[PDB]
Design a protein around this ligand. Structure first.
Ligand SMILES: [Zn+2]
Ligand SMILES: [Zn+2]
Ligand SMILES: [Zn+2]
Ligand SMILES: [Zn+2]
Ligand SMILES: [Zn+2]
Lengths: 112, 73, 302
């Protein structure tokens, strides 16, 4: 009931906080359901393991921000029409600055 | 304004790649991004960076082109 | 036109090297007290100290940096007959793999260019060059020594070829610091024939007769030929036009005696147009090229 009330007000931080520290098993399971992605390499089209940033057949490090050309080890944003992305903070600043895919391809990732 | 024979040379690509690396050394990220827009719109042969795409758990295929529903199955 | 300044840093013992990473925000200096330390330039232009730790039994001469794509590692050699690597964990560095396979003092350690992987080359006073490999960028606790090269002389310094055009096969330059009364080439170059899958002697510079202190390769930046500087009694610059090993058209371009001493260190810019040389005369002379394609000095600093 408390979590429903909290979500009603769009207070997601505290709702997830209650979820994480919830003392019952049935409540500390809502964010463990269908929240994990499966990541692929766009050159080889084969899956990569769960604790790495490189490709087993490709050998190309498939985690490179399209702004700084550095290896992204944490958070990784992803445009769905370009399959391009990078650091969470870099992409926000670039998208505030302009409306083009930073990697370079005729595509407005937000359509302004 | 280059017809698609000069741009294919192994020399005309090395200069662009080395200038881009030099721009990386400057840490002039946004200038490089703008130059990439320019090069991409004026040189079809260049293929943009190879990055990650996410894949479904049931279909197994990519989602890149109901909105919530996957387009595969 | 070069003006000097002073950098706000305090040390105790004499230091033997300084090396920037790839951007110019992290230097790594090795002291005579077997203690290497890493500075970190801040947003205000100041230099702070971040770490420090004693090294192995010998005396460290060289500390080198690595490309940021592979993480943040440094290779250092010393008279302990060993070569080391170091990775940041955050910041407490950790030993990963001491490449100990040398029966002599490993004088020099250098990193291979980015475009081919994580290799590092070392040779010791015995006169044998070693090339190492990390064929899993994941874990650095596993390396392989593929090729061993006999030099039939000693080592002083080595340098790779920054050039990354597909035409150029990998190259390496091995010096010598032997003052034997006999006269022999003290600088030699090896190539890598992919067909034989081995390193072969390619060309040697017969004009070199005295002991050599340091060798460097000027970065390519899309040029056609190569530029090489050799430390000797006199600073010399050679260019090797490409024509088994590829034949090389060798002709000198400069020969400088404006030091009245023995040259110790040679360095190059990112672009590859200014040379900085240091000698026993206590001065640092920087050479650039003029409109007549002539090599002349630009500033004498001390
Ligand atoms: Zn791949
Ligand atoms: Zn980034
Ligand atoms: Zn795109
Ligand atoms: Zn997009
Ligand atoms: Zn699917």
């Amino acid at each position: 009931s408390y979590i429903d009330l909290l979500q009603r007000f769009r207070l997601w931080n505290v709702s997830n906080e209650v979820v994480k520290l919830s003392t019952s098993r049935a409540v500390s399971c809502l964010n463990q359901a269908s929240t994990t992605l499966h990541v692929n390499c766009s050159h080889c089209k084969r899956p990569m393991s769960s604790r790495g940033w490189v490709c087993d057949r490709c050998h190309r490090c498939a985690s490179m921000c399209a702004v700084c050309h550095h290896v992204v080890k944490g958070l990784f944003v992803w445009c769905q029409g370009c399959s391009h992305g990078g650091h969470l903070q870099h992409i926000m600043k670039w998208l505030e600055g302009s409306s083009h895919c930073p990697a370079g391809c005729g595509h407005l990732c937000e359509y302004s | 304004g280059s017809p698609l024979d000069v741009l294919k040379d192994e020399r005309v690509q090395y200069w662009i790649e080395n200038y881009r690396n030099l721009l990386d050394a400057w840490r002039f990220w946004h200038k490089r991004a703008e130059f990439d827009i320019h090069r991409s719109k004026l040189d079809p042969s260049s293929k943009p960076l190879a990055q990650v795409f996410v894949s479904c758990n049931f279909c197994g295929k990519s989602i890149s082109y109901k909105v919530t529903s996957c387009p595969g199955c | 036109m070069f003006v000097a300044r002073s950098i706000a840093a305090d040390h105790k013992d004499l230091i033997h090297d300084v090396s920037f990473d790839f951007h110019g925000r992290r230097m790594a200096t090795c002291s005579s007290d077997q203690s290497v330390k890493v500075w970190d330039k801040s947003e205000s232009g100041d230099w702070h100290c971040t770490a420090s730790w004693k090294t192995h039994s010998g005396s460290v001469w060289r500390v080198t940096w690595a490309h940021p794509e592979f993480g943040q590692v440094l290779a250092s050699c010393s008279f302990d007959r060993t070569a080391a690597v170091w990775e940041e964990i955050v910041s407490h560095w950790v030993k990963r793999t001491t490449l100990v396979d040398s029966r002599t003092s490993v004088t020099d350690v250098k990193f291979a260019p980015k475009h081919m992987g994580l290799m590092l080359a070392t040779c010791s006073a015995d006169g044998i060059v070693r090339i190492y490999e990390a064929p899993d960028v994941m874990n650095l606790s596993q390396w392989s020594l593929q090729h061993e090269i006999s030099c039939k002389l000693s080592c002083s310094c080595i340098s790779w070829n920054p050039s990354s055009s597909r035409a150029h096969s990998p190259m390496i330059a091995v010096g010598s610091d032997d003052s034997s009364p006999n006269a022999m080439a003290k600088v030699q170059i090896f190539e890598y024939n992919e067909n034989t899958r081995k390193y072969a002697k390619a060309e040697t510079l017969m004009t070199v007769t005295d002991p050599v202190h340091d060798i460097a390769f000027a970065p390519n930046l899309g040029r056609s030929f190569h530029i090489l500087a050799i430390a000797t009694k006199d600073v010399r610059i050679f260019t090797l036009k490409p024509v088994g090993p590829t034949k090389f058209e060798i002709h000198i371009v400069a020969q400088f005696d404006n030091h009245n001493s023995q040259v110790w260190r040679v360095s190059w810019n990112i672009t590859g147009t200014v040379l900085a040389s240091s000698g026993d005369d206590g001065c640092v002379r920087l050479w650039k090229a003029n409109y007549m394609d002539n090599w002349k000095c630009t500033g004498i600093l001390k």
